[PDB]
Amino acid sequence: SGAIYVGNYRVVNRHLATHNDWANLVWEDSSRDLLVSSTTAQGCDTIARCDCQTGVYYCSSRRKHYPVSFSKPSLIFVEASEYYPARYQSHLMLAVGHSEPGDCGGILRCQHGVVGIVSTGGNGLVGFADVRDLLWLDEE
Ligand SMILES: NC(=O)[C@H]1CCCN(C(=O)C[C@@H]2CSCCS2)C1
Ligand SMILES: [Zn+2]
């Protein structure tokens, strides 16, 4: 589990969104595994607007933050899970690292801010849904 709290937005994995998220919906995209809902309180996370391909992510199944090198956002094929069939996911970045279902939602960050959240896993890989192109998260 986990979310990004930027401004009056909450960014979560679409497959983990709650009823309150759906009832306060701003934007969702199944191809990216992302959903954004509105919040009453202002958040403290800042979104990275950069070209970093190294950073650190939080792994809940280890209670640890790990440094990683990750690929550029791309269209990748992901195996079936409890939430989606096997398919292509867009704006996904892969790295070598530990990731269980329960680890989705952990933040990937660099010195500039939040880069994305854990969205896929297995066999020593971790995949992150990028948020750096969603410029509108910084306004309204
Ligand atoms: N975004 C998706 O299509 C994923 C939906 C949840 C399941 N999924 C995985 O890759 C399983 C990994 C287990 S390792 C922990 C992180 S998820 C596919
Ligand atoms: Zn950066």
Short mmCIF file of N, CA and C and ligand atoms in Angstrom, two decimals:
data_model
loop_
_atom_site.label_atom_id
_atom_site.label_comp_id
_atom_site.label_asym_id
_atom_site.label_seq_id
_atom_site.Cartn_x
_atom_site.Cartn_y
_atom_site.Cartn_z
N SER A 1 0.84 -1.20 0.00
CA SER A 1 0.00 0.00 0.00
C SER A 1 0.88 1.26 0.00
N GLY A 2 0.28 2.42 -0.27
CA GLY A 2 1.01 3.68 -0.24
C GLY A 2 0.47 4.67 -1.26
N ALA A 3 0.72 5.93 -1.02
CA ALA A 3 0.23 6.98 -1.91
C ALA A 3 1.21 8.13 -1.95
N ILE A 4 1.10 8.97 -2.98
CA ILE A 4 1.79 10.25 -3.07
C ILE A 4 0.78 11.31 -2.67
N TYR A 5 1.15 12.25 -1.79
CA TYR A 5 0.26 13.34 -1.36
C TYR A 5 0.90 14.65 -1.82
N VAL A 6 0.44 15.19 -2.94
CA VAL A 6 0.98 16.43 -3.50
C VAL A 6 -0.17 17.40 -3.65
N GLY A 7 -0.04 18.60 -3.10
CA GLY A 7 -1.12 19.58 -3.17
C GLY A 7 -2.40 19.03 -2.55
N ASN A 8 -3.53 19.14 -3.28
CA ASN A 8 -4.79 18.53 -2.86
C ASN A 8 -5.10 17.28 -3.67
N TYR A 9 -4.06 16.50 -3.97
CA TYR A 9 -4.21 15.26 -4.71
C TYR A 9 -3.62 14.10 -3.90
N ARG A 10 -4.21 12.92 -4.07
CA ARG A 10 -3.72 11.63 -3.56
C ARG A 10 -3.53 10.71 -4.78
N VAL A 11 -2.31 10.26 -5.03
CA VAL A 11 -2.00 9.38 -6.17
C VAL A 11 -1.81 7.99 -5.64
N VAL A 12 -2.59 7.05 -6.14
CA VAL A 12 -2.52 5.65 -5.70
C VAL A 12 -2.51 4.72 -6.87
N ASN A 13 -2.15 3.44 -6.63
CA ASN A 13 -2.29 2.42 -7.69
C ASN A 13 -3.81 2.30 -7.95
N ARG A 14 -4.21 2.30 -9.22
CA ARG A 14 -5.64 2.19 -9.54
C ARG A 14 -6.22 0.91 -8.94
N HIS A 15 -5.44 -0.19 -8.94
CA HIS A 15 -5.96 -1.46 -8.45
C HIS A 15 -6.16 -1.48 -6.92
N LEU A 16 -5.60 -0.51 -6.18
CA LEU A 16 -5.76 -0.41 -4.73
C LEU A 16 -6.66 0.75 -4.30
N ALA A 17 -7.26 1.48 -5.28
CA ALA A 17 -8.11 2.61 -4.94
C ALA A 17 -9.31 2.21 -4.07
N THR A 18 -9.62 3.03 -3.08
CA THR A 18 -10.78 2.80 -2.17
C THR A 18 -12.08 3.38 -2.73
N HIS A 19 -13.25 3.09 -2.06
CA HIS A 19 -14.48 3.74 -2.45
C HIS A 19 -14.38 5.26 -2.31
N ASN A 20 -13.68 5.75 -1.25
CA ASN A 20 -13.57 7.20 -1.10
C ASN A 20 -12.76 7.80 -2.29
N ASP A 21 -11.71 7.06 -2.76
CA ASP A 21 -10.97 7.53 -3.94
C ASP A 21 -11.90 7.66 -5.17
N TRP A 22 -12.67 6.60 -5.45
CA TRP A 22 -13.59 6.62 -6.59
C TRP A 22 -14.70 7.70 -6.46
N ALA A 23 -15.12 7.97 -5.21
CA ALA A 23 -16.17 8.98 -4.99
C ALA A 23 -15.62 10.42 -5.06
N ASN A 24 -14.28 10.58 -5.04
CA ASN A 24 -13.62 11.91 -5.12
C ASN A 24 -12.60 11.90 -6.25
N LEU A 25 -12.97 11.28 -7.36
CA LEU A 25 -12.05 11.01 -8.46
C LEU A 25 -11.63 12.23 -9.25
N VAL A 26 -10.36 12.39 -9.51
CA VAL A 26 -9.83 13.43 -10.41
C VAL A 26 -9.49 12.82 -11.79
N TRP A 27 -8.76 11.68 -11.82
CA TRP A 27 -8.29 11.10 -13.08
C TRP A 27 -7.90 9.66 -12.81
N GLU A 28 -8.14 8.78 -13.78
CA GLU A 28 -7.67 7.41 -13.66
C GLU A 28 -7.26 6.89 -15.03
N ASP A 29 -6.31 5.95 -15.05
CA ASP A 29 -5.87 5.35 -16.30
C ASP A 29 -5.44 3.91 -16.04
N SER A 30 -6.26 2.96 -16.48
CA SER A 30 -6.01 1.55 -16.29
C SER A 30 -4.69 1.11 -16.98
N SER A 31 -4.37 1.66 -18.16
CA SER A 31 -3.13 1.29 -18.86
C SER A 31 -1.87 1.64 -18.09
N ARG A 32 -1.94 2.63 -17.17
CA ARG A 32 -0.81 3.06 -16.35
C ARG A 32 -0.89 2.54 -14.90
N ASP A 33 -1.99 1.91 -14.49
CA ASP A 33 -2.26 1.52 -13.12
C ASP A 33 -2.25 2.71 -12.15
N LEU A 34 -2.81 3.86 -12.60
CA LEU A 34 -2.81 5.04 -11.73
C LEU A 34 -4.24 5.59 -11.53
N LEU A 35 -4.47 6.13 -10.33
CA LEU A 35 -5.73 6.84 -10.01
C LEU A 35 -5.37 7.98 -9.08
N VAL A 36 -6.00 9.14 -9.31
CA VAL A 36 -5.78 10.33 -8.51
C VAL A 36 -7.11 10.79 -7.95
N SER A 37 -7.18 10.99 -6.65
CA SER A 37 -8.38 11.52 -5.98
C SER A 37 -8.07 12.86 -5.29
N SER A 38 -9.12 13.62 -4.94
CA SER A 38 -8.92 14.91 -4.27
C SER A 38 -8.88 14.73 -2.76
N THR A 39 -8.15 15.63 -2.08
CA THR A 39 -7.99 15.58 -0.61
C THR A 39 -8.41 16.92 0.00
N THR A 40 -8.82 16.87 1.27
CA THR A 40 -9.17 18.11 1.97
C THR A 40 -7.88 18.78 2.48
N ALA A 41 -6.95 17.99 3.02
CA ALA A 41 -5.69 18.54 3.54
C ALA A 41 -4.60 18.59 2.45
N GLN A 42 -3.67 19.55 2.54
CA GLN A 42 -2.57 19.68 1.59
C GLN A 42 -1.45 18.71 1.94
N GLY A 43 -0.90 18.06 0.91
CA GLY A 43 0.20 17.13 1.08
C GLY A 43 1.56 17.76 0.99
N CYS A 44 2.58 16.96 1.40
CA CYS A 44 3.97 17.46 1.48
C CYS A 44 4.93 16.92 0.45
N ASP A 45 4.49 15.96 -0.36
CA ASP A 45 5.36 15.43 -1.39
C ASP A 45 5.50 16.41 -2.56
N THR A 46 6.64 16.48 -3.15
CA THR A 46 6.89 17.28 -4.37
C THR A 46 7.17 16.27 -5.50
N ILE A 47 6.69 16.54 -6.71
CA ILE A 47 6.93 15.65 -7.85
C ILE A 47 8.23 16.07 -8.56
N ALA A 48 9.10 15.11 -8.88
CA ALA A 48 10.30 15.33 -9.67
C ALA A 48 9.96 15.70 -11.11
N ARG A 49 10.67 16.71 -11.64
CA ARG A 49 10.48 17.14 -13.02
C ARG A 49 11.89 17.11 -13.58
N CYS A 50 12.31 15.92 -13.93
CA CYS A 50 13.71 15.68 -14.25
C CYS A 50 13.87 14.46 -15.15
N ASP A 51 15.18 14.15 -15.43
CA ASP A 51 15.54 13.00 -16.24
C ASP A 51 16.34 11.95 -15.47
N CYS A 52 16.21 11.89 -14.15
CA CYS A 52 16.96 10.89 -13.37
C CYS A 52 16.58 9.46 -13.78
N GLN A 53 17.57 8.57 -13.83
CA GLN A 53 17.35 7.12 -14.03
C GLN A 53 18.00 6.28 -12.88
N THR A 54 18.35 6.99 -11.79
CA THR A 54 18.78 6.40 -10.54
C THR A 54 18.01 7.08 -9.40
N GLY A 55 17.69 6.33 -8.40
CA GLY A 55 16.94 6.87 -7.27
C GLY A 55 16.82 5.83 -6.18
N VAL A 56 15.82 5.99 -5.29
CA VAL A 56 15.66 5.10 -4.15
C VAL A 56 14.19 4.79 -4.03
N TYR A 57 13.84 3.53 -3.74
CA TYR A 57 12.42 3.20 -3.52
C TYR A 57 12.18 2.57 -2.16
N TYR A 58 10.96 2.68 -1.64
CA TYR A 58 10.57 2.01 -0.40
C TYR A 58 9.92 0.67 -0.67
N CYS A 59 10.49 -0.33 0.00
CA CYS A 59 10.02 -1.72 -0.08
C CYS A 59 9.39 -2.10 1.28
N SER A 60 8.05 -2.15 1.37
CA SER A 60 7.37 -2.45 2.65
C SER A 60 7.66 -3.85 3.18
N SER A 61 7.87 -4.84 2.24
CA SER A 61 8.18 -6.23 2.64
C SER A 61 9.58 -6.45 3.20
N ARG A 62 10.39 -5.37 3.21
CA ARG A 62 11.70 -5.38 3.84
C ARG A 62 11.86 -4.24 4.85
N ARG A 63 10.86 -3.35 4.99
CA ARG A 63 10.98 -2.11 5.79
C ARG A 63 12.30 -1.36 5.44
N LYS A 64 12.58 -1.24 4.16
CA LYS A 64 13.85 -0.65 3.73
C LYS A 64 13.70 0.15 2.47
N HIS A 65 14.53 1.19 2.33
CA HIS A 65 14.67 1.97 1.12
C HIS A 65 15.93 1.45 0.38
N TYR A 66 15.79 1.13 -0.89
CA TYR A 66 16.89 0.59 -1.69
C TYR A 66 17.26 1.53 -2.83
N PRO A 67 18.56 1.77 -3.02
CA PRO A 67 18.98 2.51 -4.24
C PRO A 67 18.81 1.64 -5.47
N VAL A 68 18.35 2.20 -6.56
CA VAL A 68 18.14 1.43 -7.81
C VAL A 68 18.45 2.27 -9.02
N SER A 69 18.84 1.57 -10.10
CA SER A 69 18.90 2.09 -11.47
C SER A 69 17.62 1.60 -12.16
N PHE A 70 16.93 2.43 -12.89
CA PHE A 70 15.67 2.05 -13.49
C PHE A 70 15.59 2.50 -14.91
N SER A 71 14.84 1.76 -15.73
CA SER A 71 14.71 2.06 -17.15
C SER A 71 13.82 3.28 -17.41
N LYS A 72 13.88 3.82 -18.61
CA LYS A 72 13.05 4.96 -18.98
C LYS A 72 11.59 4.50 -19.12
N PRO A 73 10.61 5.37 -18.88
CA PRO A 73 9.20 4.95 -18.96
C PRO A 73 8.88 4.36 -20.34
N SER A 74 8.28 3.19 -20.36
CA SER A 74 8.05 2.45 -21.59
C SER A 74 6.76 1.61 -21.50
N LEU A 75 6.41 0.96 -22.65
CA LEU A 75 5.28 0.04 -22.74
C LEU A 75 5.86 -1.37 -22.53
N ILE A 76 5.53 -2.00 -21.41
CA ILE A 76 6.07 -3.29 -20.98
C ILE A 76 4.99 -4.32 -20.77
N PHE A 77 5.33 -5.59 -21.03
CA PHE A 77 4.36 -6.67 -20.84
C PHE A 77 4.47 -7.17 -19.40
N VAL A 78 3.32 -7.24 -18.68
CA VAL A 78 3.30 -7.66 -17.28
C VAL A 78 2.45 -8.93 -17.16
N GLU A 79 2.91 -9.94 -16.40
CA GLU A 79 2.16 -11.18 -16.20
C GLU A 79 0.90 -10.91 -15.39
N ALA A 80 -0.07 -11.84 -15.52
CA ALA A 80 -1.33 -11.77 -14.79
C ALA A 80 -1.11 -11.70 -13.29
N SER A 81 -1.96 -10.94 -12.64
CA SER A 81 -1.94 -10.85 -11.19
C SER A 81 -3.41 -11.04 -10.68
N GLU A 82 -3.69 -10.79 -9.36
CA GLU A 82 -5.10 -10.84 -8.90
C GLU A 82 -5.91 -9.64 -9.50
N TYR A 83 -5.22 -8.58 -9.95
CA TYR A 83 -5.89 -7.33 -10.38
C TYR A 83 -6.00 -7.06 -11.86
N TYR A 84 -5.07 -7.64 -12.63
CA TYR A 84 -5.12 -7.41 -14.08
C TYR A 84 -4.76 -8.73 -14.76
N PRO A 85 -5.22 -8.91 -15.99
CA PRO A 85 -4.75 -10.07 -16.77
C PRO A 85 -3.31 -9.76 -17.26
N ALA A 86 -2.64 -10.72 -17.91
CA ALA A 86 -1.34 -10.44 -18.54
C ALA A 86 -1.60 -9.40 -19.67
N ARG A 87 -0.82 -8.30 -19.72
CA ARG A 87 -1.08 -7.22 -20.68
C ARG A 87 0.14 -6.29 -20.79
N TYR A 88 0.04 -5.28 -21.66
CA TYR A 88 1.01 -4.20 -21.76
C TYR A 88 0.56 -3.04 -20.86
N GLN A 89 1.48 -2.57 -20.02
CA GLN A 89 1.30 -1.40 -19.15
C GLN A 89 2.17 -0.26 -19.70
N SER A 90 1.64 0.94 -19.77
CA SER A 90 2.38 2.07 -20.28
C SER A 90 3.03 2.89 -19.14
N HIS A 91 4.04 3.70 -19.53
CA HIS A 91 4.76 4.60 -18.64
C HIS A 91 5.35 3.81 -17.43
N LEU A 92 5.80 2.60 -17.67
CA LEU A 92 6.36 1.73 -16.62
C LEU A 92 7.89 1.74 -16.71
N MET A 93 8.56 1.74 -15.56
CA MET A 93 10.04 1.71 -15.47
C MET A 93 10.42 0.48 -14.66
N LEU A 94 11.39 -0.31 -15.12
CA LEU A 94 11.78 -1.51 -14.38
C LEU A 94 13.15 -1.36 -13.72
N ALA A 95 13.34 -2.07 -12.61
CA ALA A 95 14.64 -2.09 -11.91
C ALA A 95 14.80 -3.50 -11.30
N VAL A 96 16.02 -3.82 -10.88
CA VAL A 96 16.26 -5.03 -10.15
C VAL A 96 16.05 -4.72 -8.66
N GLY A 97 15.12 -5.43 -8.05
CA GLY A 97 14.81 -5.21 -6.62
C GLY A 97 13.67 -6.09 -6.18
N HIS A 98 13.52 -6.24 -4.85
CA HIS A 98 12.44 -7.03 -4.28
C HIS A 98 11.06 -6.34 -4.33
N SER A 99 9.94 -7.02 -4.67
CA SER A 99 8.61 -6.44 -4.76
C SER A 99 7.59 -7.57 -4.64
N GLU A 100 6.83 -7.63 -3.53
CA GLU A 100 5.64 -8.52 -3.30
C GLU A 100 4.35 -7.72 -3.52
N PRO A 101 3.18 -8.43 -3.71
CA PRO A 101 1.91 -7.73 -3.62
C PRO A 101 1.76 -7.66 -2.06
N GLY A 102 1.71 -6.43 -1.83
CA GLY A 102 1.60 -5.57 -0.69
C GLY A 102 2.59 -4.43 -0.89
N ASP A 103 3.70 -4.59 -1.71
CA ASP A 103 4.67 -3.52 -1.92
C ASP A 103 4.20 -2.40 -2.87
N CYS A 104 3.10 -2.64 -3.62
CA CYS A 104 2.58 -1.56 -4.49
C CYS A 104 2.26 -0.33 -3.67
N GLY A 105 2.61 0.84 -4.22
CA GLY A 105 2.36 2.10 -3.54
C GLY A 105 3.61 2.71 -2.94
N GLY A 106 4.68 1.91 -2.76
CA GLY A 106 5.93 2.46 -2.24
C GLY A 106 6.49 3.52 -3.20
N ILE A 107 7.01 4.60 -2.65
CA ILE A 107 7.52 5.68 -3.51
C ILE A 107 8.93 5.41 -4.02
N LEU A 108 9.14 5.73 -5.31
CA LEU A 108 10.46 5.85 -5.92
C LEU A 108 10.76 7.36 -6.01
N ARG A 109 11.93 7.78 -5.57
CA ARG A 109 12.29 9.21 -5.55
C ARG A 109 13.72 9.40 -5.97
N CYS A 110 14.02 10.67 -6.32
CA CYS A 110 15.39 11.13 -6.56
C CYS A 110 15.56 12.47 -5.73
N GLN A 111 16.73 13.17 -5.84
CA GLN A 111 16.93 14.47 -5.15
C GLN A 111 15.92 15.54 -5.55
N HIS A 112 15.25 15.36 -6.71
CA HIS A 112 14.26 16.34 -7.18
C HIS A 112 12.87 16.15 -6.64
N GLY A 113 12.58 14.95 -6.10
CA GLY A 113 11.26 14.66 -5.61
C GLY A 113 10.81 13.26 -5.99
N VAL A 114 9.50 13.08 -5.93
CA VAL A 114 8.87 11.79 -6.22
C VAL A 114 8.83 11.51 -7.72
N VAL A 115 9.26 10.32 -8.11
CA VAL A 115 9.36 9.89 -9.49
C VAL A 115 8.17 9.02 -9.87
N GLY A 116 7.74 8.13 -8.97
CA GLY A 116 6.64 7.22 -9.25
C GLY A 116 6.36 6.32 -8.07
N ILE A 117 5.53 5.29 -8.29
CA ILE A 117 5.17 4.36 -7.20
C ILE A 117 5.29 2.94 -7.70
N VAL A 118 5.59 1.99 -6.79
CA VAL A 118 5.68 0.59 -7.17
C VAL A 118 4.33 0.14 -7.72
N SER A 119 4.37 -0.56 -8.85
CA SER A 119 3.16 -1.04 -9.55
C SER A 119 3.26 -2.51 -9.93
N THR A 120 4.46 -3.05 -10.20
CA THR A 120 4.59 -4.48 -10.62
C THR A 120 5.75 -5.13 -9.85
N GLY A 121 5.80 -6.47 -9.87
CA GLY A 121 6.90 -7.17 -9.21
C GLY A 121 7.04 -8.62 -9.65
N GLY A 122 8.10 -9.23 -9.12
CA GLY A 122 8.39 -10.65 -9.28
C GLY A 122 9.82 -10.95 -9.68
N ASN A 123 10.33 -12.10 -9.22
CA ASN A 123 11.63 -12.65 -9.61
C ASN A 123 12.78 -11.68 -9.61
N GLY A 124 12.85 -10.86 -8.57
CA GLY A 124 13.94 -9.95 -8.43
C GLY A 124 13.79 -8.75 -9.31
N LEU A 125 12.58 -8.48 -9.86
CA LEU A 125 12.33 -7.20 -10.57
C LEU A 125 11.27 -6.38 -9.82
N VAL A 126 11.32 -5.06 -9.96
CA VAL A 126 10.29 -4.16 -9.42
C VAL A 126 9.97 -3.16 -10.54
N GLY A 127 8.70 -2.88 -10.76
CA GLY A 127 8.28 -1.93 -11.79
C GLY A 127 7.56 -0.76 -11.15
N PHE A 128 7.86 0.43 -11.67
CA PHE A 128 7.31 1.68 -11.10
C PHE A 128 6.47 2.39 -12.15
N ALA A 129 5.30 2.87 -11.71
CA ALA A 129 4.47 3.72 -12.58
C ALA A 129 5.02 5.14 -12.49
N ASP A 130 5.53 5.71 -13.62
CA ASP A 130 6.07 7.07 -13.63
C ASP A 130 4.94 8.09 -13.45
N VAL A 131 5.24 9.18 -12.75
CA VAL A 131 4.29 10.30 -12.64
C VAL A 131 4.91 11.63 -13.10
N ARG A 132 6.16 11.63 -13.56
CA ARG A 132 6.86 12.89 -13.88
C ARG A 132 6.26 13.67 -15.04
N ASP A 133 5.50 12.99 -15.92
CA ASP A 133 4.87 13.71 -17.04
C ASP A 133 3.54 14.35 -16.67
N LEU A 134 2.99 14.05 -15.48
CA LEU A 134 1.67 14.55 -15.07
C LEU A 134 1.83 15.93 -14.44
N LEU A 135 2.02 16.92 -15.33
CA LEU A 135 2.35 18.27 -14.87
C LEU A 135 1.27 18.92 -14.04
N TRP A 136 0.02 18.55 -14.34
CA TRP A 136 -1.12 19.12 -13.64
C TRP A 136 -1.13 18.79 -12.16
N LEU A 137 -0.38 17.78 -11.69
CA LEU A 137 -0.32 17.51 -10.24
C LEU A 137 0.23 18.72 -9.48
N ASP A 138 0.98 19.62 -10.15
CA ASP A 138 1.63 20.77 -9.48
C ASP A 138 0.74 21.99 -9.38
N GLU A 139 -0.50 21.94 -9.90
CA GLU A 139 -1.38 23.12 -9.89
C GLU A 139 -2.80 22.79 -9.45
N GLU A 140 -3.62 23.83 -9.23
CA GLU A 140 -5.04 23.79 -8.88
C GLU A 140 -5.24 23.66 -7.40
N1 LIG B 1 0.32 -3.04 -12.45
C1 LIG B 1 0.07 -4.30 -12.75
O1 LIG B 1 -0.37 -4.68 -13.84
C2 LIG B 1 0.28 -5.28 -11.61
C3 LIG B 1 -1.00 -5.45 -10.79
C4 LIG B 1 -0.70 -6.21 -9.51
C5 LIG B 1 0.01 -7.54 -9.81
N2 LIG B 1 1.10 -7.39 -10.78
C6 LIG B 1 2.37 -7.75 -10.55
O2 LIG B 1 3.28 -7.44 -11.30
C7 LIG B 1 2.66 -8.61 -9.35
C8 LIG B 1 3.79 -8.03 -8.54
C9 LIG B 1 4.09 -8.91 -7.38
S1 LIG B 1 5.60 -8.20 -6.72
C10 LIG B 1 4.83 -6.73 -5.98
C11 LIG B 1 4.46 -5.76 -6.92
S2 LIG B 1 3.24 -6.33 -8.13
C12 LIG B 1 0.73 -6.68 -12.00
ZN ZN B 2 15.58 13.73 -10.37
#
